[PDB]
Design an enzyme around this catalytic site. Structure first.
Site, PDB file in Angstrom:
ATOM      1  N   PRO A  44       0.820  -1.207   0.000  1.00 52.40           N
ATOM      2  CA  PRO A  44       0.000   0.000   0.000  1.00 52.40           C
ATOM      3  C   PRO A  44       0.863   1.271   0.000  1.00 52.40           C
ATOM      4  O   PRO A  44       2.017   1.239   0.408  1.00 52.40           O
ATOM      5  CB  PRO A  44      -0.795  -0.094   1.313  1.00 52.40           C
ATOM      6  CG  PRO A  44       0.054  -0.917   2.248  1.00 52.40           C
ATOM      7  CD  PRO A  44       0.985  -1.754   1.364  1.00 52.40           C
ATOM      8  N   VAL A  46       0.190   6.032   0.074  1.00 44.91           N
ATOM      9  CA  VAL A  46      -0.729   7.059   0.414  1.00 44.91           C
ATOM     10  C   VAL A  46      -1.078   7.940  -0.796  1.00 44.91           C
ATOM     11  O   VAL A  46      -1.837   8.912  -0.699  1.00 44.91           O
ATOM     12  CB  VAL A  46      -0.214   7.855   1.629  1.00 44.91           C
ATOM     13  CG1 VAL A  46      -0.214   6.919   2.917  1.00 44.91           C
ATOM     14  CG2 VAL A  46       1.143   8.568   1.331  1.00 44.91           C
ATOM     15  N   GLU A 152       2.712  13.908  -5.537  1.00 44.29           N
ATOM     16  CA  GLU A 152       1.934  13.338  -6.655  1.00 44.29           C
ATOM     17  C   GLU A 152       1.811  14.343  -7.807  1.00 44.29           C
ATOM     18  O   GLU A 152       1.916  13.950  -8.937  1.00 44.29           O
ATOM     19  CB  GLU A 152       0.559  12.834  -6.182  1.00 44.29           C
ATOM     20  CG  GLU A 152       0.613  11.833  -5.008  1.00 44.29           C
ATOM     21  CD  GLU A 152       1.391  10.563  -5.332  1.00 44.29           C
ATOM     22  OE1 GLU A 152       1.740  10.307  -6.527  1.00 44.29           O
ATOM     23  OE2 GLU A 152       1.630   9.777  -4.393  1.00 44.29           O
TER      24      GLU A 152
HETATM   25  C1  LIG Z   1       5.030  11.798   1.734  1.00 41.87           C
HETATM   26  C2  LIG Z   1       5.159  11.845   0.219  1.00 41.87           C
HETATM   27  C3  LIG Z   1       4.119  10.885  -0.316  1.00 41.87           C
HETATM   28  C4  LIG Z   1       4.814   9.767  -0.985  1.00 41.87           C
HETATM   29  C5  LIG Z   1       3.783   8.849  -1.614  1.00 41.87           C
HETATM   30  C6  LIG Z   1       4.481   7.487  -1.812  1.00 41.87           C
HETATM   31  C7  LIG Z   1       3.865   6.704  -2.969  1.00 41.87           C
HETATM   32  C8  LIG Z   1       4.270   7.259  -4.311  1.00 41.87           C
HETATM   33  O1  LIG Z   1       5.301   6.901  -4.867  1.00 41.87           O
HETATM   34  N1  LIG Z   1       3.433   8.151  -4.822  1.00 41.87           N
HETATM   35  O2  LIG Z   1       3.757   8.726  -5.995  1.00 41.87           O
HETATM   36  C9  LIG Z   1       4.388   6.504  -0.612  1.00 41.87           C
HETATM   37  O3  LIG Z   1       3.299   6.032  -0.240  1.00 41.87           O
HETATM   38  N2  LIG Z   1       5.541   6.103  -0.061  1.00 41.87           N
HETATM   39  C10 LIG Z   1       5.393   5.070   0.991  1.00 41.87           C
HETATM   40  C11 LIG Z   1       4.612   5.633   2.229  1.00 41.87           C
HETATM   41  O4  LIG Z   1       4.829   6.818   2.507  1.00 41.87           O
HETATM   42  N3  LIG Z   1       3.683   4.858   2.942  1.00 41.87           N
HETATM   43  C12 LIG Z   1       3.342   3.423   2.694  1.00 41.87           C
HETATM   44  C13 LIG Z   1       1.996   3.132   3.387  1.00 41.87           C
HETATM   45  C14 LIG Z   1       1.841   4.219   4.445  1.00 41.87           C
HETATM   46  C15 LIG Z   1       2.868   5.313   4.116  1.00 41.87           C
HETATM   47  C16 LIG Z   1       3.719   5.617   5.359  1.00 41.87           C
HETATM   48  O5  LIG Z   1       4.412   4.437   5.815  1.00 41.87           O
HETATM   49  C17 LIG Z   1       6.688   4.287   1.275  1.00 41.87           C
HETATM   50  C18 LIG Z   1       7.568   4.112   0.034  1.00 41.87           C
HETATM   51  C19 LIG Z   1       7.466   4.980   2.358  1.00 41.87           C
HETATM   52 ZN   LIG Z   2       6.077   8.668  -6.001  1.00 49.37          ZN
END
Ligand SMILES: CCCCC[C@H](CC(=O)NO)C(=O)N[C@H](C(=O)N1CCC[C@H]1CO)C(C)C
Ligand SMILES: [Zn+2]
Ligand SMILES: CCCCC[C@H](CC(=O)NO)C(=O)N[C@H](C(=O)N1CCC[C@H]1CO)C(C)C
Ligand SMILES: [Zn+2]
Lengths: 189, 193
Positions: A44, A46, A152
């Site tokens: 998953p 966000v 995004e």
């Molecule tokens: C804050 C900037 C937002 C980044 C969004 C990214 C996803 C992405 O690549 N969007 O383009 C993400 O979810 N990254 C994950 C993430 O932030 N997650 C995964 C699920 C919940 C959340 C926090 O742990 C992982 C790779 C760390």
């Molecule tokens: Zn990204």
């Protein structure tokens, strides 16, 4: 379901096209939006931009839930102003900052697996665009939701976080908790 | 026991390495560190290493590009990259300076950033002054790919990784290496020379 495209595929590094607002409610667009939501949820993560599933169009999806937030300690959540928010879908989004306030925190991208870096983002944003049914919407956000929105919207201009990260902060996920090097600015606001 | 390579995020890689006292170079202590570097470089296999990469805060670099490594890359790429074989080389307290304004743009990876590559602009021609492993004073004049390896290794000594000096929009997974550069990215190659 489409697989999440990795850094190196030119669709990630190119400007995405606007979608005709009058087509947003069509089958083709509605499937792309539905695919994006399934893929975001299966990772998953966000947030997701359409180029990350191979689609050169200006569409983002994003959500943060009590569950996702429960994986992180209360102290982290507080510093990050990280709060749950409902599934949002924005077509042809245009982001602008509400003030000059920024925070610096670690970010990861599903298109750059196993790494993080510290990235400076505006705290306060407004984003105009259309929703999933083609209705014009304006979205104001602060804290972590704001950050996700810039992440995004970035993807739609062919921009990843590696090309605007603080120097010397890039790192493996296993090295996430190691100190910042001499000279890096501190995390937070 | 052989040191493991240190990965991006560990401060030793992001901070400036200290000089070796020239009087200390010929000691068992420094010779073991050098031997460990050569062995870690070869195991990888890779074409150069800096001491911070095995967790040692000292200004030491090693490098080696053999006819056997080179024998795997396409003939066309070897020509464009001006990639020529060279014997094992060790430099203590290296000081690097360009010899002209001529640059070239090709892909690099780092042992400290596993799984990725990016386009990095380098000088074609450099001179490096320092000490060899016997603590003798040396100068090396290099060009082409060897000049490139010298720049990447010397950068490690000042706390600098390629990711912070790469052409925007070129960072990629190894598996995506040969996919087209995006619109607006400069082409790979060099200045006439
Ligand atoms: C804050 C900037 C937002 C980044 C969004 C990214 C996803 C992405 O690549 N969007 O383009 C993400 O979810 N990254 C994950 C993430 O932030 N997650 C995964 C699920 C919940 C959340 C926090 O742990 C992982 C790779 C760390
Ligand atoms: Zn990204
Ligand atoms: C080109 C600039 C200098 C590269 C040095 C790096 C090693 C490193 O991180 N040194 O600090 C390397 O050997 N990288 C490898 C490399 O260049 N190799 C591995 C074996 C032969 C040679 C070409 O494939 C991989 C990651 C590509
Ligand atoms: Zn390296």
């Amino acid at each position: 379901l489409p697989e999440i495209v990795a850094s190196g595929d030119p669709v990630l590094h190119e400007k995405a096209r606007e979608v005709d607002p009058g087509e947003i409610g069509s089958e083709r667009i509605q499937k792309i939006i539905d695919d994006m939501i399934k893929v975001m949820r299966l990772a998953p993560c966000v947030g997701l931009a359409a180029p990350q599933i191979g689609v050169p169009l200006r569409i983002i999806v994003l959500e943060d839930t009590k569950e996702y937030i429960s994986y992180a300690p209360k102290e982290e959540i507080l510093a990050q102003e990280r709060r749950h928010f409902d599934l949002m879908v924005m077509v042809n989004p245009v982001l602008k900052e509400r003030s000059n306030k920024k925070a610096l925190f670690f970010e990861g991208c599903e298109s750059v697996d196993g790494f993080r870096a510290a990235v400076e983002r505006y705290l306060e944003v407004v984003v105009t665009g259309y929703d999933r049914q083609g209705k014009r919407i304006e979205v104001n956000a602060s804290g972590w939701q704001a950050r996700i929105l810039q992440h995004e919207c970035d993807h739609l201009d062919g921009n990843l976080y590696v090309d605007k990260m603080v120097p010397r902060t890039f790192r493996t996920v296993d090295n996430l908790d190691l100190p910042l090097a001499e000279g890096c600015p501190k995390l937070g606001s």
